[PDB]
Amino acid sequence: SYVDKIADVMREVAEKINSDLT
Amino acid sequence: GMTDCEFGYIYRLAQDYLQCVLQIPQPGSGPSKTSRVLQNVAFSVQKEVEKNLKSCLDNVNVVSVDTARTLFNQVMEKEFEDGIINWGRIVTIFAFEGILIKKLLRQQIAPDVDTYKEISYFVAEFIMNNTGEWIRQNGGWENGFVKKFEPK
């Protein structure tokens, strides 16, 4: 689904945010 | 505090962020320190998500609040389907409502002055009911999010 493509980018950026804190 | 996971506080956060995106800060001394910290982090995320989804989002015409709500709900369900909650994911919720309000600004068929309040509302609904317990257990906004994301 096209929703999956959006959610995938959201998941990826979210974990970059968590890791980028350090 | 522990009660900042209740609806009213989260709604204010969601509304504050959309008012920042739309460049209509409301009069007063300004938003809370939570909102002030959230606005830079969420906007940085928003610009990156907009970049990484330019083609995908250009193929979606967000012509109404109902379209925005249904899309928001579907994206949120997929994003959180693995059961994982963390501050990065919560920040992306705010970034996504900023994306939606920008697309509504260009494509909404019947604009209403309270559109951003309607978007903020169902955003706060989702945050509270789907992440509120995790937020509370991790210090809430003041003792969790701000402590981790504020300048050192």
From Swiss-Prot, chain B:
Chief location bin: cytoplasm
Keyword Membrane: no
Disulfide bonds: none
Keywords: Apoptosis, Cytoplasm
Pfam families: Bcl-2
A single BP term in Gene Ontology: mitochondrial fusion
InterPro entries named among the record's database cross-references: Bcl-2-like_sf, Bcl-2_BH1-3, Bcl-2_fam, Bcl2-like, Bcl2_BH1_motif_CS, Bcl2_BH2_motif_CS, Bcl2A1
Keyword Transcription: no
GO molecular function, one term: channel activity
Tissue-specific expression: Seems to be restricted to the hematopoietic compartment. Expressed in peripheral blood, spleen, and bone marrow, at moderate levels in lung, small intestine and testis, at a minimal levels in other tissues. Also found in vascular smooth muscle cells and hematopoietic malignancies.
Motif residue range(s): BH1: 78-98
Record's subcellular location: Cytoplasm
Position of sequence motif BH2: 133-148
Cellular component annotations (GO), alphabetically ordered: cytoplasm; cytosol; mitochondrial outer membrane
Induction, as annotated: By phorbol ester and inflammatory cytokines, such as TNF or IL1B/interleukin-1 beta, but not by growth factors.
Subunit structure: Interacts directly with BAK1, BID, BMF and BBC3. Interacts directly with BCL2L11/BIM. Interacts with BAX isoform Sigma. Interacts directly with PMAIP1. Interacts with RTL10/BOP. Interacts with ING4. Interacts with UBQLN4.
Role summary: Retards apoptosis induced by IL-3 deprivation. May function in the response of hemopoietic cells to external signals and in maintaining endothelial survival during infection. Can inhibit apoptosis induced by serum starvation in the mammary epithelial cell line HC11.
Assigned protein family: Belongs to the Bcl-2 family.
The protein's name: Bcl-2-related protein A1
